[PDB]
Amino acid sequence: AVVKCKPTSPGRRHVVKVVNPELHKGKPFAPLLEKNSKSGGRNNNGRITTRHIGGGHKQAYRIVDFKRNKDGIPAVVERLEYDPNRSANIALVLYKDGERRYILAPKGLKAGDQIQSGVDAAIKPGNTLPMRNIPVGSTVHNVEMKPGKGGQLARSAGTYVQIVARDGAYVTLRLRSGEMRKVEADCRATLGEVGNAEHMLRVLGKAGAARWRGVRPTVRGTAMNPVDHPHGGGEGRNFGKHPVTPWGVQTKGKKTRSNKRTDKFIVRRRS
Amino acid sequence: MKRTFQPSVLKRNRSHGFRARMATKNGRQVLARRRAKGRARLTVSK
RNA sequence: AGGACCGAACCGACUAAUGUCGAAAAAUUAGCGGAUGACUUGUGGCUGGGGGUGAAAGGCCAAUCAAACCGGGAGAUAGCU
RNA sequence: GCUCGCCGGAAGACCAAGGGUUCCUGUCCAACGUUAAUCGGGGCAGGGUGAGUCGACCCCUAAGGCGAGGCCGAAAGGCGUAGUCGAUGGGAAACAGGUUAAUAUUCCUGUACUUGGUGUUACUGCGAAGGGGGGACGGAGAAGGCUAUGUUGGCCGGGCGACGGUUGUCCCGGUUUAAGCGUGUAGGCUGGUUUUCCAGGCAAAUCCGGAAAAUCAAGGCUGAGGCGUGAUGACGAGGCACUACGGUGCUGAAGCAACAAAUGCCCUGCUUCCAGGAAAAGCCUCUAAGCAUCAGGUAACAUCAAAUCGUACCCCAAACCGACACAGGUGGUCAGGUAGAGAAUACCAAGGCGCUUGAGAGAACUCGGGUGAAGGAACUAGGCAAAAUGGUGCCGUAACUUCGGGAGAAGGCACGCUGAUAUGUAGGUGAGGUCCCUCGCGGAUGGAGCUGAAAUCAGUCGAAGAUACCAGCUGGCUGCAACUGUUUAUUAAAAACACAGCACUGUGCAAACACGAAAGUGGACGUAUACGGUGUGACGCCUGCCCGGUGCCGGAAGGUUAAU
RNA sequence: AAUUCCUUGUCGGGUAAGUUCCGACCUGCACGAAUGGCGUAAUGAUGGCCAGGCUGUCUCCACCCGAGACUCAGUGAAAU
RNA sequence: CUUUAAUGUUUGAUGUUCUAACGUUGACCCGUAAUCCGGGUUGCGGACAGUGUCUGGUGGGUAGUUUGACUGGGGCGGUC
RNA sequence: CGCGGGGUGGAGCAGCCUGGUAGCUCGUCGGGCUCAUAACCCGAAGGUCGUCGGUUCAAAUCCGGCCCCCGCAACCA
């Protein structure tokens, strides 16, 4: 739940947290934990390719069963966990045969709930079924692109993909950004909205609040010398140039999209 | 002040050692050039 | 609880004096700022020259940086001394 | 050798790093030492480093490196799989005392422990590059239980003391003891046990997990310290005895109690919040491929092995790094007395030193300082520098405000010692005695002894009772910036940068973008509440008009338009 | 005004005296709305100004304590 | 010569469909205890995508250079 | 000090460029409309083209001196 802490110190006077009384406060399930080596934004070469990335806090990786291949098995939700890697919550589900797996927790899911997968499943929040078995107009998430791939659409906190129309072998979807996209019918999708939808209302407050997230200080171009950035220079704050990225590529309105091999799948571009 | 040379034999032997040279081709020539010049202090080791 | 308060270790380096063939190729003395944090430090690695890195000064990259050092083009060229 | 002085959370005592004989002894004084030098980290010669338990090597991994094949690239070579390396990480095992000119948890004495081989005896199913458990972990905060350690008392030994006194509530010194084994507590964690079943765990499974039942209420794991034992042992102040007079040999009393108490230990705990906190092996355990009169495993015993290397000395410095015997820099550990909140600080203990040029003079002037009549910033670019304020409890405290603050605002009162309340209170600790019992490291009750604030009254001394060291100057208006923070190492610390927040725009995932001739990576093992770029920079009230020029986006009919 | 050249603009307050300061008037050489505008509690080793307090900064320096300077013995440079 | 119609022929430019090139950073198996890679089944795209050669455009991201002389110092103005 | 532009009925602006004929709107006068004004409709007058001189068949126009205004410049030590 959203709470605005009391201004008892400078830096705290703007911090708003989302404190959830449903999260399991104990240690995560050890069997599904594996190390997560941080990059710092450097590639194989070691050169910084993506800036502002590094530092942060050591956060362990929790594998998640995005695939959901276990079908016709009545599973029971056990407890909700905190995932430092995903903005959404992860529910630890226990299968009927004794296998425990993590899944992206939806909106209407609590401890002690029952969910099943496959084409057998009913239309109930949390269930997974091939998209050609779902009624058009409904809303799903953790949608796959190709059958058996794993699921890639709408996996963030509070996101949801609503199915628009289904013309046989292909299913038309309206993505989150307002991008009409097609997808073959044999792809699976998990029902319901993704939980923790108030995550966007979280103002970090402190400067260091970004530092332990992994975000590193970003220097503006208008404050650099001409040999470091296309912008910059000038005695006493002067700009006068056409806004670009550090490499001359025009920003503030410039389409960089050029794939063409998957252009066939797009029905409408966002507006 | 903190002088620009805080010695540590491990690092000195790893980035300037005999085997560090014999790894890459460029390193091999450094040993080769020195042998033609006849320098006894061939590399940095014991 | 706190990028919370006073304040040693520790780190940093605003003021003045001394020093400038110095004790020292930027220090000392008397006072300072932070001091649970964007903190600091040990050990060990990765990124490299028109490249690296940079809470961004054109600062740092072994006392040398608006383009490091060493060898080679090369006895460069000089209407200049 | 007798005095004086200095450090004493170091200028002490130990390791790593890094040096490389600088360690100790004899001897030498030319060269080195900023002075002389019989002195020395200087020359010459000799001696010294003793390990199954410390560390490295070794077993196993992290960041990352190399990388059979493989992919890619004019060549060089780059990336990377299985593997194989790489600690600052985890993993078996020792302490006390004595001894040297120098080394010793290494040598000797005493008492123990650990990993394996072989053999013997009695039992019994063993067995992987495979499964599971475990290893295995965050920050901060508070309390309890203890110890290192310290003080007092009892006791033992000695003294009764060069100017007045001191056989007494007087004085000084000592009162040290581990590893291991047994007991398994203060405390923490968790419901055990048994039967059946299964799409779970790349195969199997008696192990883990899940799903049904029965029985009973506890069992088990972990755990500092204490008490015994180790130990009628060692050590031990002081004497007794020989001096090459440096020290060696001999002998040896007391050796307990009470209280205070760590930043150390239990705690790699418990609670709580969030930014949500390595891997693998050792070990335990289940089986497959197979092997079964075997081989192997469990337990006890005997014996053997535990190798190679380092080990000296310095280690907040004349030995490392700075050209020097250089006022600088160098990570970790132990860390006492009184005062004190404290690792501040003052003076001391242990311990180690007086900084490797001195002696006289007492001028100007120069540096570090003490005090200063009257005035009190009139100095000056400017209150720069000095001076002053400075602690604790209590009283009291404005404008303004985001209602947290502002604020320790400002401004004040009491602070010493002695007696009394009380032959030291409240409180803490707590034996003996009494009683019970699921009988032990137990619980109630009990209260001696020990220790010990603060408040009040009364009396008294000095000019001064926070007396020393240590230790805020305050208030008013206002520019800029929100704030913590960061920056030109070596003239600039700010109004400059960052900042959470906001906006715009890009990107539908083999994503945009970036590095790379390529592959492949980072982005992200994330996926539009995400990610890149840009601009501005908390919060509050807002953010007007212009698409002519430039850029960008959209639509393409027409004109023009390269190669072909 | 961190912007105003002209200029020490004009008026008021502060002072015996105020080219700086504070509050206003608009004649804005040449402010202005995210190269953001106007305010803002707290914060600031920040900039300007005033007052109290306190003092050798000053009026105008005076004395004393140590380290040099001076003389003597030893050693023994440097810039030019 | 113009306007034009049936046929034959010639290539060009679009649209739909398919599978064989190719792609496949989809699932599965083996080499192999290996998420690289290769081969093999299959699904999905599809003669696109992408690569090479040629070519137009944008292009300070990047590089090599130019940026006059006289002048009562130079710049400005003027001149050649 | 230099460079460019400008000065036109009462006012604000074109026409100069590439010479012979000066235009638009408001303002003014007279008339009409209305009870009266304004507005509206109709017609007309109004300009030494800053000044002086020269060149020219002809000058607002091409050139030069001067007067007034506006902008730029008046810098580097």
Swiss-Prot record, chain A:
Effect of residue 229 to Q: Loss of peptidyltransferase activity in reconstituted ribosomes. No change in rRNA binding or assembly into ribosomes
Domain of life: Bacteria
Region (Disordered): 27-52, 220-271
Coiled-coil spans in chain: none
Pfam family, one: Ribosomal_L2_C
GO cellular component: a single term: cytoplasm
Example GO biological process: cytoplasmic translation
GO molecular function: RNA binding; rRNA binding; structural constituent of ribosome; transferase activity; zinc ion binding
Keyword Phosphoprotein among record annotations: no
InterPro entries registered for this protein in UniProt: NA-bd_OB-fold, Rib_uL2_dom2, Ribosomal_uL2, Ribosomal_uL2_bac/org-type, Ribosomal_uL2_C, Ribosomal_uL2_CS, Ribosomal_uL2_dom3, Ribosomal_uL2_RNA-bd_dom
Key words, A-Z: Acetylation, Ribonucleoprotein, Ribosomal protein, RNA-binding, rRNA-binding
Xref: HAMAP family: Ribosomal_uL2_B
Record-stated family: Belongs to the universal ribosomal protein uL2 family.
PANTHER family: LARGE RIBOSOMAL SUBUNIT PROTEIN UL2M, RIBOSOMAL PROTEIN L2
Function: One of the primary rRNA binding proteins. Located near the base of the L1 stalk, it is probably also mobile. Required for association of the 30S and 50S subunits to form the 70S ribosome, for tRNA binding and peptide bond formation. It has been suggested to have peptidyltransferase activity; this is highly controversial.
UniProt xrefs under NCBIfam families: rplB_bact (TIGR01171)
Note: This protein can be partially replaced in vivo by its H.marismortui (HmaL2) or human (L8, from the 60S cytoplasmic ribosome) homolog.
Subunit structure: Part of the 50S ribosomal subunit. Forms a bridge to the 30S subunit in the 70S ribosome, contacting the 16S rRNA. Interacts weakly with S6 in one of the 3.5 A resolved structures. In pull-down experiments interacts with CedA.
Protein name: Large ribosomal subunit protein uL2
Species this protein is from: Escherichia coli (strain K12)
Phylogenetic lineage: Bacteria, Pseudomonadati, Pseudomonadota, Gammaproteobacteria, Enterobacterales
UniProtKB/Swiss-Prot annotation, chain B:
A GO cellular-component term linked to this record: cytoplasm
PROSITE patterns listed in its UniProt record: RIBOSOMAL_L34
Keywords: Ribonucleoprotein, Ribosomal protein
Transmembrane portions of the chain: none
GO biological process: cytoplasmic translation
Gene Ontology MF term list: structural constituent of ribosome
InterPro entries the UniProt entry points to: Ribosomal_bL34 (IPR000271), Ribosomal_bL34_CS (IPR020939)
Family, per entry: Belongs to the bacterial ribosomal protein bL34 family.
Listed HAMAP family: Ribosomal_bL34 (MF_00391)
Subunit note: Part of the 50S ribosomal subunit.
Full protein name: Large ribosomal subunit protein bL34
Organism field: Escherichia coli (strain K12)
Name of encoding gene: rpmH
